[PDB]
Ligand binder design. Sequence first.
Ligand code: HEM
Length: 154
Amino acid sequence: MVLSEGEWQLVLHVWAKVEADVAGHGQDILIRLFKSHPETLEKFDRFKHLKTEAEMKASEDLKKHGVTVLTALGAILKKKGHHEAELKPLAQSHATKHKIPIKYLEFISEAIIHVLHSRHPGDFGADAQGAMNKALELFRKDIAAKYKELGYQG
Ligand code: HEM
């Protein structure tokens, strides 16, 4: 809810490692999300027809959209919680157009933490993970607040 400057630096130190291969991370994150939570795939009319992990990895539009995800997320994270202006277009389209429940943001957050671990075994330790979780929690909480502002979600 408030992160220390140290936790923010951990988050941004890790994020520079994402920005080194945004496509790879975005792809992996989306695939982890769809594998571990197939219900989220159904929300993508563009991808719902991708079934094996092998198909997802070969979809360049899935990879493109991972880039879309992560660059939007990275913009937010670089604001270190001063992200109201960035969240509202995101909350607006995910509440009202995509109709994404906040719970699915929790799933993709777990997918992010997981993919960060498999792509950075020695870099993503307990501290950075604690920090990244706080930052994604703050993100989720502020998105949820923005949902209710738009009059949405339980
Ligand atoms: C870190 C969390 C997330 C970020 C930063 C993010 C960001 C974005 C962005 C930038 C777009 C493109 C513009 C827009 O439509 O708003 C998008 C589209 C979309 N998002 Fe997300 N999203 C996140 C989580 C999720 C989750 C978990 C789901 C569904 C389970 C979802 C469902 C969708 C859908 C269906 C679209 C339209 C996709 C398409 O055009 O094929 N989002 N998202």
